[PDB]
Amino acid sequence: TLDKIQKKVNDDIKNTVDEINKIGEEIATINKQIYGQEALPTEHANELRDRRDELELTLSKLVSAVASKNEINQDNRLDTTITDPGHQYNLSIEGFSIVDGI
């Protein structure tokens, strides 16, 4: 029994990895979308923001919770008016973080 529990947590470890990647990339993908030239459309924008922020807490459950947040602006001179993940959205992890927010 002891070993099965020891194996089980290892299974919990191995199973936790893919789901975090499975759920994490979904969030990361959602961050891809929220971070195009994303002058987000008011009504459905803040729903995009809130759902993404809402999902942060569910991510904090399994893994680190320390991410950096900001926001960016755009104009009718749409140019390449991109919205950033990097300093705007990045998690702290593993001792040194090298991560894309999307």
Binding site: N15, E19, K22, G36, Q37, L78, D79, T80
Partner: protein
């Protein structure tokens, strides 16, 4: 170049994907119990047989 705008979406089919684990927790404890409980019923029966 870098100046962007968006449009709509489309559809092709329907889905139901694959992700099973927590259900295993109870299952594993079950069939071992299936071995034990059956064996218990039969073994005790076996005990009295010719007393």
């Amino acid at each position: 170049g870098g100046v962007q705008v968006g449009t709509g979406t489309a559809v092709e089919s329907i889905v139901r994907l694959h992700d099973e684990y927590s259900y295993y927790k109870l299952k594993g404890a079950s069939n071992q119990l299936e071995y034990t409980k059956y064996m218990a019923s039969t073994l005790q029966e076996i005990a009295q047989r010719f007393p």
